[PDB]
Structures are given as C-alpha cells and as structure tokens.
Paper text:
[name] (also termed Ti-VAMP) (Advani et al., 1998; Galli et al., 1998) is one of the largest R-SNAREs, having a 120 residue N-terminal longin domain (Pryor et al., 2008; Rossi et al., 2004). It is involved in the fusion of lysosomes, late endosomes, and compartments derived from them with a number of target membranes including the plasma membrane and endosomes (for a comprehensive review of [name] function see (Chaineau et al., 2009)). [name] (subunits δ, β3, μ3, σ3) is one of the family of heterotetrameric clathrin adaptors that in mammalian cells has been localized mainly to tubulovesicular, early-sorting/recycling endosomes with a minor location at the trans-Golgi network (TGN) (Peden et al., 2004; Simpson et al., 1996; Theos et al., 2005). We show that the linker of the δ-adaptin subunit of [name] binds the [name] longin domain and determines the structure of their complex.
Author numbering:
A (entry chain A): 19 to 173
B (entry chain B): 21 to 172
Write the structure that this text describes.
Amino acid sequence: TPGVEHIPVVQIDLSVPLKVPGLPMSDQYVKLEEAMAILFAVVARGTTILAKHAWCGGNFLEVTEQILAKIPSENNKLTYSHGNYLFHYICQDRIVYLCITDDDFERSRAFSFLNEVKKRFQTTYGSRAQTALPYAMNSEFSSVLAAQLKHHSEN
Amino acid sequence: GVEHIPVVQIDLSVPLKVPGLPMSDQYVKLEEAMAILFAVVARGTTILAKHAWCGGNFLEVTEQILAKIPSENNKLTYSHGNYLFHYICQDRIVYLCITDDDFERSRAFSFLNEVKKRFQTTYGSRAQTALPYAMNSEFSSVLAAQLKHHSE
Ligand SMILES: [Pr+3]
Ligand SMILES: [Pr+3]
C-alpha cells in the first residue's frame, strides 16, 4: 500500500463533535451499536405514582408497579438489575425517585439525574407530596422530567 | 461516584420490554492502528452510500464535514478530538472515512482508493446525478466488506 505524508493533516472545528459510545473510564473501548440512556423516570410515594415520563415505548408502569412494591419505606438509595436494564432509586422521607436505564448507562449519571429531579420536585411541591393523590403532579411535572431526562442522557 | 451504593438482582413476574432497541451490547478494544469506523461516498453535500462499523453520531458529523470540503480534486486528512477524517475528492465525488487519531493513514487511503475504483466501475456516470442515498441499499455492503478487510 502506497505513501501519504505529502497529504497534510488539517485541524478543524465542529459544532457537534463525534461521539462514539464506549466506557466511562478508558478510551480504547467502543460499543459496536448504540447505547441508550435513561428510558423512564417516576416520582412516587410508596406504591402511589405522582408523576412519570417515558422516552419511548415500554411496559413501564407494569414494571414500575412491581418495583415500588419491593422498595422499603426507610430512606436509602439502591440499584436493581434485571435483563439488560437497571433500575436506580432514591427513597427520601418516603418519596421515591426512580429511573430505568440501559445496562450501559453510567450509574453516577443516573443518580445525578435523580438528585436533580428530587431537588426540583421538593422545591416545586414541598410538603404536598406527602399527601397528594395519584398522578396529581403529572400534568405539570412530566415535562420537567422529560427535559431532565434529555439533558442527563446527553451530558 | 456511586460504588458504595449496591446493585441487587431482582426477579419480576412481568419483566421489562422495550421494543426498538438493539439486540445486544458488543464492546471491542479498539485496534487504534487498524480501525476504520465509518465510510461514506458523497457528491458535495449529498450522501450516496454509507456504512458504520460501530455506534456514533456519524451522519451528524458527516454533514458538518462535507460542508467544508472544496469541490476541486484533492486528498486530505482533518483532525478533530481523537479522530481523523480522510477523504479523496475526485470529479466532485468525495470518498471519506473516519478513524482514530493513531491509525495508519496509508491504510486509510488505500481503502479509499479501493472503494473509489469499485464505486466508479459499478456506478460510472450515474454518480454525477444520482439522488440522495440512491446507491446506499446496494453499496453499503461493499463498503462494509472493504471496511472489514482493511481493518484486518
Ligand atoms: Pr444494553
Ligand atoms: Pr488515540
């Protein structure tokens, strides 16, 4: 095969630079197909959902009802693993902030998302969340959830 | 950081189904010196065939690249971040590929010359006029085969 240093290498700028999916540590790694990020997010109290949002199709409420039934009411944080998906939540003052993500998504990014959502939900709705009825916050908040889902799934 | 937070296996009666996602997660350790990641044939800003080997915003970037390339014949490599973009423009048709920053450029241009030869013998003068993605269904697989070959 022939010779090429007569051909220069030019530095250029890009508005949207190239992002190859890989791993969050090392950079000799590539995924041969797409990684997806946060698929679904829900705020709940115990077994009662208050707001939600999904990015695409999925039996998210079916699964969410099964999850919430398992989570203890005492404060804590945790990740559940099933098939190719992970479920991350924070329970605080009995309110659960949960999301569902590709197995290939960085957990730390997931919990940052959850902390952010919590901060906004708590500043927006305060004590109301302790008593509010099913889906009470959904019409207003789902769109907050959708914007954060987008934000944290890119950057 | 979240290493302290455990990861627990659970079981479900009715498990999660999300249609429209890829069948699996395949990660490779990257042959930085033998890894052509993407290849595209275009006329000016109009793409005619393409093929990607791995995940990436290749069409996003490709639109930004083609915008920069002058129409007169020439060959060149562009550098951005950890990647290089190598092209041959000939009779306005652009043959471009994307690779790591440490890849052997001579291998890239060999690939590009090969692809050009085939595209030109297969499609001849059509390339001057053919509509967007017109050659893609049939040629992407030629691109994929050569991509595989020149990466090994
Ligand atoms: Pr996956
Ligand atoms: Pr490198």
